[model samples]
Target: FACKTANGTAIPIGGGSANVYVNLAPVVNVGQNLVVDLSTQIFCHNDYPETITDYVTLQRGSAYGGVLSNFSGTVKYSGSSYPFPTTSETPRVVYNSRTDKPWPVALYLTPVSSAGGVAIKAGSLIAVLILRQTNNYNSDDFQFVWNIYANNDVVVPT
Candidate 1:
């Protein structure tokens, strides 16, 4: 199954959305693999260049829990003139099925900036597990999961 945004851009369902709730009933078998791709764009106005930082935190539990893994990426502008727009930023995370315990999990995306700069807009993509169970298998198992992009201060998408 597949999902898309209002503008027709394909979106990763089961992943939370504030304005729209996309329910793509894609099931994951015990030995099957799942992959998710997330992406978003932020616009830095002409007033000033902005510093964009991306963060991902894995968590489990109800109201409270500790982070499993965290990763981040950053982009800084020097106020220099540019010939054209460019996307010089990309972040990634890999989950080993052999090590990741089979349990409910959640992921988050955060973009931050320093003082005097505009907000940093962003989005993300997630690739679920690829089940591998065999004598020669050196990978991990596939499982269930969810995606969340929390809208917070300094992290805005245009």
Candidate 2:
């Protein structure tokens, strides 16, 4: 629903395009790890629908590709409702070439026990996107855009 720091601080949405806003972050140095925590929450007071599965797709821009070419990483969903994938779970990087700019990739999350749906415990740390800066970067040199599909459970990040 929204992007946050590993410590749960909300990253301001500078603006949007095609109904999606960009999550803004300060300039980071090379060899630094960019950590973004994925979260979800109900907007309406009485419309808390549970979700059987949830997904977050992250697509990087050309500027970002110049810095972090490899988008291979794991989703951190530990101690949460959908803490299933412990090791083998990873984001599906969708590029034929590593140098492909505007790198596009996808990852998903689900409950360990999906006997029933799970409510997104508001402000829930659903998962974490961990990517490292492999090369040098400049001001406004990169941008990470994300698309979330909650399986109609209806939610947004806090």
lDDT of each: 0.22, 0.25
Which pairs clash in the backbone of model 1? 36-126, 36-127, 38-124, 38-125, 97-140, 98-140
Give model 2's TM-score versus the native structure. 0.24
lDDT of 2 by residue, 22-73 (tens): 2312232223333333333101010111421112223231212211222223
Off by over 4 Å in 2: 1-103, 111-114, 136-158
lDDT of 1 by residue, 94-130 (tens): 2233221221122232222221222321222221211
Residue 131's lDDT in candidate 1: 14
The true-structure Cα RMSD of candidate 2 reads: 18.6
- The best candidate by TM-score is 2
| Model 1 superposed RMSD (Cα) | 20.5
The Cα error of candidate 1 at residue 118, in Å, is: 44
Question: What's the number of clashes in each of the models?
Answer: 6, 0
Candidate 1 Cα misplacement greater than 4 A, ranges: 1-20, 23-25, 40-47, 50-158
